[PDB]
Structures are given as structure tokens and as C-alpha cells.
Amino acid sequence: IKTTPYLEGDVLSSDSGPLLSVFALQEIMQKVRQVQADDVQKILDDIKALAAEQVYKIVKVPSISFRHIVMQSRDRVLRVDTYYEEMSQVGDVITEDEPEKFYSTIIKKVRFIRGKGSFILHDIPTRDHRGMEVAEPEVLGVEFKNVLPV
């Protein structure tokens, strides 16, 4: 199935030409642009990427939650929560002049708090005790490897 020849310049040809869908997208975009006046491959590949969107994700170890700092004194240490520190920088500067920036930052923070907790454990690592089976310290949400020697 070959197309009939057509004249370009002063010579015949039988080239297939661009895809019909690409032509339709670019001509529709051109019509919209000329209407509003007074790249289609990007949107096609972005449709393709959106087709394979994933809402959750599978994990091997839970994300770290609490951490500790030595205080040069053996009696007490410092405990901090990594969630607050991590979530602190996700926002943006807020000005009363533009409410859209404020509400966009709030929406972004809500999206962050949604996306941080979306995880599923599959197979935790574990070790064998003398009579029972106990999980490794890595799977826990507390890191204290740097406070043990003191």
C-alpha cells in the first residue's frame, strides 16, 4: 500500500509524511494559539508517562523517624524527630499579597504528608536468636548507632 505521487517544488514524490495524529495535535494547538494571540511530542510522551502512574510504592525498610545527639554528658541525650525537620523545608515563603502562593504551599504540604506515609513492607530482614526469631535493628525507626560507645 503506497500513496500516489504528489508534486513538491518541481519533482514528484511518494513520501508517507508525518503522522495524522501529530498533524491534528499541532494544527489544533496552532488554532488555539492564533485565537489567543490577539512541542506536540512532549505532550504525547507525557500522556504516555501519565498512563503508567503509580500511587504507592513498596519498601524494604521503613524510613527513619527518630534520631539522637550526644550532649557531652552521660546522664542525658537529645532526641529529635526526623519528620518535622524533613517536612520543614518542603514549603515556601508566604506573603499576604498573593493568596495563591499561600494556598499552593498548603496544598504542596498536604501532598507531601500524603506521599510520605504511602509505603508497604514486603520482606523485613531478621536474625535467629537462641530460641526465637528477632528483627534486625535496621528495620526499626530509631537510629542510635552513634550513641552506644559512650
Binding site: 500500500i1 503506497k2 500513496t3 500516489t4 505521487p5 504528489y6 508534486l7 513538491e8 514528484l12 495524522l20 495524529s21 491534528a24 495535535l25 489544533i28 494547538m29 488554532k31 485565537v35 489567543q36 505532550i43 504525547l44 507525557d46 500522556i47 501519565l50 498512563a51 503508567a52 500511587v55 504507592y56 513498596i58 539522637h68 550532649m71 557531652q72 554528658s73 546522664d75 542525658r76 541525650v77 537529645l78 532526641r79 529529635v80 518535622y84 525537620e85 520543614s88 514549603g91 515563603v93 508566604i94 506573603t95 493568596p99 495563591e100 499561600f102 494556598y103 499552593s104 498548603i106 496544598i107 504540604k109 504528608i113 508497604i120 513492607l121 514486603h122 520482606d123 523485613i124 542510635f144
Partner: protein, 663 residues
């Protein structure tokens, strides 16, 4: 995930097989074999039978739905001549008679001709969404015969009136004028004519016996002069998988569900020519008729087979599209108009669209439509929750508009939705009333994302939890410094500092500044003077009223002077003699820091000591226990959550990756 939803899986796979036997030409693979197990665990993150209303309840989205449908369902094809091997043969065989048909035939197209032909075919694919208009350049010269023949062929190629149209009144009147001009070009022998009283075109009678050709004049009430002349075109049958596209469209009243049949308009046109006394083009059309019929039959097939999706127009919209155009005031559906040339009609008449390969995105359409519906439902619930949150706290959340909410919720979104909505809203405008109508509509698409967002909004109802606070204070304090005189004493003790408050200050001995007070002081140039005067009395000042964002940091050596001398506002002097002396930004970066000095750094005291004593200003009181001095004897007290997990041999599965993998 703990719940049981096998019946939902059976309904979903039933919808798969329903669409499959509706679309049996290309869909064959089915995945019931994996579902008949009891070991692995599936997740139903997305629901397949999507409610169509959720994609049509959004205001002014016809362009976006059309563009996404044509991106996800349009195949590709080629254009062939009515008879091949005509390029090599001499034109002496091609032209044998005299007339506009003889002078036109034997020509060869250019690139623009083929572009206009494929534009005509694309417009013919969509019955109502795409309309055609003539592209007329005032400053051009053109032979009359091409206009004559283009009119006389476009009076038959397209359709008008009846139940749907793809023409404007402008092209209808121009084609009628061109047909009138063609019928009175006398190159052959003479034919008697009889003209009527009124003066609209085509109002005359020709031939030895009079023929009322004024019926051929275009009229959109019934569509007499085109393919919609007294022929049924839309019908209904056994219900479709989609509940909003129950219609079946056919052009010439034909269906292969047989070679050598005609219809009313073609026979009437042929009788009109044979009455006119021109037999050359009569025999020409008589010979070319089967090619015309088969091309309309197979374009009917490709229209009814491929372009049936959720983005197609609903039945009520399809019915009401034409009377709105006749009235002249579009309400909710707005077609887009496509320009085209004169010669394009004849060359599209000769050529036929021949699809060769289908669109590779056709298989994964249900995933795209489900994702789109879920995203729109998420936008709706975000609208509702932002409105409720703004209503909850009037004194610390500023009042806003639905347009700002829409811009904010559209900014944070997958960019396919952003792009299509931007194009749709650039083509047709929106209003506050439309947004209110959209937000009080109750249509929603259940999904995992909806439940997760709802529960996250429930967990985020506390504004103080999400690091938004208004308890910011300015007060002059002396920053302590390590003594450093005795190395053994510095080792024995330690340096720990923070700007955190264990308790808020007293009710008295403090004032409150809002936006307008500070703005007035800045306009008058008495802001810093007032702050210094009130600081001289050893009091505190609170910048309340508007929520602020607070960053948190840790340090060991001395931090840079930016965080020591940070100010909640920024001052900018303006030009002389203006509205105000200077402007202020009431909220800038505000950082809380925890200083825990490393002991070994005392070996190099250049990292610790400053040059002269300094002051720190900002102070934040937050009720959460972000940093805690804890005895080691209770350090295991944090372990109080219960977690569940699976085994290595256990496998999780989702229907999306099962569906996209194909055979």
C-alpha cells in the same frame, strides 16, 4: 488494603471482556487465568467502570476531551488515487472532452493541497466538533473554473442539516453561489431556462421539462441540498459498553452488516445533470460512484469502531449541538472551525483515506481515563477541604476567591492535566458561577487516592502541626559564648543553645502588630524608630495575624550572621516623593536553630569565638516537642507502634501492570 473486594474484580474483568467483544478487531488478550488463585494479593487502587459525568461536569472542557480523544484513538493512513498508474500515462488519454472538468483533471497536487485534503478528512471524521470555513485571501488571482467545479463537487461531498452538521452558513451560501454559477456556464448547446420571482440563488428551472432546482439551496432545518436529504443517519442498537455513546452514525444510510446501491441525493444530482444537458460529467460520476460509496462505508466503519471512548460527546450534547448553532448562542458545547482552500474539495473527492496502522496508545486507554477521573475527584475534594479550612480559621487564614483555589490546585498536578486544561481554558473562558456549579455537584469517582487525601486532610486539620504558626516575637537578648578559659572545664561542661521558648511570654509587657499598623508606620517612616523605642523599655513585640513558615536547622560551629541577625520583615526604601517612604515584606525566611558545639573544635578556637558581642532577635514558641532532653533510662519509650509485614515468597500485584503488559 485489608478488606475483601473480589466481586469488584469480577465486575472489572467483566467490563474488560465487554469492551473486548465490542472491540474484537484489535483486543484479544484476557487475563482471567491469574485471577483464579488464592496465594498472591492484589490491590484495587483504581476502579475500571468510570462514571462519565465526572469528566463532563468540569466546565468548558470540550476542547480538552476532544484533543485527548484524538491523541489516544486516532490511527494513521495513506491517500491513494481512484485509479493507479495514471502518473506514467500521457494526459492525451486523460483529457478527451471540453469543460471545467476537462480543464481541471490531469493536475498534480502540491504539499498544501495534500495538507488541505487531510484536513478535510480529519474534519469529516468528527461530525460535530470540527467545522470547516473557507480561507479567502483578498489579494489573489484565480481561475473561475476551479471555483465552479469545487462548488459543484462540495455540494455533494459533505453533509448539512438533518440532525448534525459539519458546515457553517458561510460555506453553504458560497457553495450554493458556486453551483448557481456553474449551472449557467454555457459551453455546450443552449438549454431553455425559466427564472423565478424572488432573487436567491438556484431559484430557476432548467431543461425541456422544468426542474425545481431551488430545493438544492441549503437549509439547515431539513438539509435538502446535501447528503442528509431525507435519509436516516443516526440509529440505536444493543447497549454499548459506554453509557453515554449509545448512538451509531452512518453517512449514506448504508451498513455492511453488497455492491451497487445508491441514495437519494446522488440520484437527484445525476438527474439534475442529465436535465442540464451535460452528459460528460454525468458519465464521469456514474463511473466513479462505487469508489465514493466504498470510501464512505469504510470511513463510517473507522468512525464507529475506533473513536468510541469516554471522551466522545454524550447523547444530549450531540442532539443539542445543532440547534444551539442554529440559534446563534453557544451554551456549553463550542466547536472549533478549520480553514480550507477551494481546490481541496475536488482533490479530497478523488482521493480516499486508507488507514494502515492503528494508534499504539489504544490499548492503554482505560488506565488513562481512570487516572483522569481520579485526578478530577481529587481536585474536587481539595476544593471542598480548602473552602472548609478557610471557613474554620478566619483570623489567621486570609479570605480568597475560588479562582485562586483553582490556580493553586492546578499548579500542583500532573502536567498532562495542566496542559489540556490550559488549552481548554485558553480556547473558552470560565467564570466564578461555573466554578461554584462545579463544586456543588455531587458526582465523585471512588479511588484509593480519594480516601488517602481525605484521611490526610483529616490528619492535617491542625495548623500548628504542619509548621504553620503565628507566635513569633522580637526581643533583644545577649547571645552567650563559651568561656574557653579552662580547657578541662570546657570539656567537663558543654555549650547548648536554642531560640526556643519553653513558655509564651506574659499577657502584659507585649504589644501586637498587624499588617495595616506596620504598613502605616512604614508609609510614615516611623517603623524602626517605634521598634527601637519599644525595645528600650525591655518589652516584646508579636507579629500575629498571618501564619508564617518556619525552617529548622542544627549547627556545631558558629552559624553565619544571617541566622543570628535575622528579621521577620524586609525593609526596602522606595523612590523619593512617592506614595510611601519605604515598603515592607511582612514575612520572610525565619529559621530556628539548635547550637550543639563540638568539644574537639576547642582545639581550633577560630571556629567558635566571635569578635564583638552580638544580639539575636527572632523567637518562636511552638507547642510540639521537636527536641527533647531525655535520660537514657527511658530512651526505649518511643517503641509503641505496631507494624505488619509479609514474606519473601508472597507477591503483591496490581491490575494496571497486568493490563499494560499485553500478550
Amino acid at each position: 488494603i485489608e478488606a475483601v473486594q473480589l466481586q469488584e474484580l469480577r465486575n472489572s474483568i467483566g467490563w474488560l471482556e465487554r469492551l473486548g467483544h465490542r472491540k474484537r478487531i484489535t483486543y484479544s488478550q484476557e487475563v482471567l487465568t491469574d485471577f483464579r488463585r488464592q496465594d498472591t494479593i492484589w490491590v484495587l487502587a483504581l476502579q475500571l467502570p468510570v462514571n462519565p459525568q465526572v469528566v463532563w461536569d468540569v466546565p468548558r472542557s470540550s476542547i480538552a476531551n476532544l484533543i485527548m480523544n484524538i491523541a489516544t484513538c486516532l490511527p494513521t493512513g495513506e491517500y491513494i488515487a481512484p485509479n493507479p498508474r495514471i502518473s506514467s500515462i500521457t494526459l492525451t488519454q486523460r483529457i478527451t472532452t471540453t469543460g471545467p472538468f476537462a480543464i481541471l483533471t490531469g493536475s498534480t497536487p502540491t504539499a498544501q493541497q495534500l495538507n488541505d485534503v487531510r484536513k478535510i478528512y480529519l474534519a469529516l471524521m468528527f461530525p460535530g466538533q470540527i467545522i470547516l470555513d473557507l480561507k479567502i485571501d483578498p489579494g489573489e488571482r484565480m481561475d473561475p473554473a476551479v471555483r465552479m467545479v469545487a462548488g459543484v463537487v462540495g455540494h455533494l461531498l459533505f453533509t448539512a442539516g438533518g440532525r448534525f452538521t459539519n458546515l457553517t452558513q458561510n460555506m453553504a451560501r458560497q457553495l450554493d453561489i458556486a453551483l448557481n454559477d456553474y449551472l449557467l456556464y454555457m459551453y455546450n448547446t443552449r438549454v431553455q431556462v425559466n427564472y423565478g420571482p424572488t432573487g436567491e440563488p438556484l431559484d430557476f428551472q432548467i431543461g425541456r421539462n422544468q426542474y425545481d432546482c431551488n430545493v438544492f439551496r441549503a437549509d439547515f432545518a431539513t438539509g435538502t441540498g446535501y447528503n442528509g436529504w431525507a435519509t436516516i443517519d443516526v440509529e440505536y442498537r444493543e447497549p454499548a459498553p459506554y453509557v453515554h455513546a449509545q448512538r451509531y452514525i452512518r453517512y449514506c444510510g448504508i451498513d455492511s452488516r453488497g455492491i451497487g446501491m445508491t441514495y437519494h441525493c446522488y440520484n437527484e444530482m445525476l438527474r439534475m445533470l442529465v436535465a442540464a444537458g451535460k452528459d460528460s460529467e454525468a458519465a464521469y460520476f456514474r463511473s466513479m460512484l462505487p469508489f465514493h460509496m466504498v470510501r464512505f462505508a469504510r470511513i463510517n466503519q473507522i468512525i464507529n469502531e475506533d473513536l468510541h471512548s469516554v471522551f466522545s460527546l454524550p447523547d444530549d450534547m450531540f442532539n443539542a449541538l445543532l440547534p444551539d448553532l442554529i440559534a446563534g448562542a453557544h451554551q456549553n458545547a463550542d466547536p472549533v472551525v478549520l480553514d480550507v482552500s477551494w481546490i481541496s474539495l475536488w482533490f479530497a473527492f478523488n482521493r480516499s483515506f486508507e488507514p494502515t496502522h492503528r494508534n499504539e496508545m489504544l490499548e492503554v486507554a482505560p488506565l488513562i481515563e481512570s487516572v483522569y477521573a481520579s485526578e478530577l475527584s481529587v481536585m474536587k475534594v481539595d476544593m471542598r477541604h480548602l473552602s472548609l479550612m478557610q471557613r474554620r480559621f478566619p483570623d489567621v487564614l486570609i479570605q480568597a476567591r475560588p479562582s485562586h483555589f483553582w490556580k493553586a490546585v492546578l499548579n500542583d498536578s500532573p502536567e498532562a492535566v495542566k496542559a489540556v486544561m490550559n488549552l481548554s481554558h485558553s480556547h473558552n473562558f470560565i467564570n466564578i458561577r461555573d466554578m461554584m456549579r462545579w463544586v456543588m455537584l455531587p458526582s465523585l469517582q471512588p479511588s484509593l487516592k480519594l480516601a488517602l487525601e481525605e484521611e490526610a486532610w483529616a490528619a492535617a486539620n491542625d495548623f500548628e502541626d504542619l509548621m504553620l504558626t503565628d507566635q513569633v516575637y522580637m526581643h533583644r537578648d545577649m547571645l552567650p559564648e563559651p568561656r574557653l578559659d579552662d580547657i578541662e572545664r570546657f570539656r567537663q561542661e558543654g555549650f547548648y543553645y536554642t531560640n526556643m521558648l519553653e513558655a509564651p511570654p506574659e499577657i502584659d509587657r507585649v504589644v501586637q502588630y498587624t499588617y495595616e499598623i506596620a504598613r502605616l508606620q512604614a508609609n510614615m517612616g516611623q517603623f524602626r524608630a517605634a521598634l527601637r523605642r519599644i525595645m528600650d523599655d525591655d518589652d516584646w513585640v508579636r507579629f500575629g495575624g498571618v501564619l508564617r513558615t518556619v525552617r529548622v536547622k542544627f549547627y556545631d560551629a558558629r552559624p553565619p550572621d544571617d541566622v543570628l541577625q535575622g528579621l521577620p520583615f524586609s525593609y526596602d526604601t522606595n523612590e523619593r516623593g512617592g506614595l510611601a517612604y519605604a515598603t515592607i515584606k511582612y514575612a520572610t525566611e525565619t529559621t530556628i536553630f539548635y547550637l550543639i558545639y563540638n568539644v574537639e573544635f576547642s582545639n581550633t578556637p577560630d571556629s567558635l569565638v566571635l569578635i564583638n558581642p552580638t544580639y539575636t532577635m527572632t523567637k518562636v514558641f511552638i507547642n510540639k516537642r521537636i527536641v527533647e532532653r531525655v535520660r537514657v533510662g527511658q530512651i526505649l519509650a518511643v517503641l509503641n507502634r505496631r507494624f505488619v509485614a509479609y514474606k519473601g515468597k508472597m507477591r503483591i500485584m496490581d491490575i494496571t501492570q497486568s493490563l499494560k503488559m499485553g500478550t
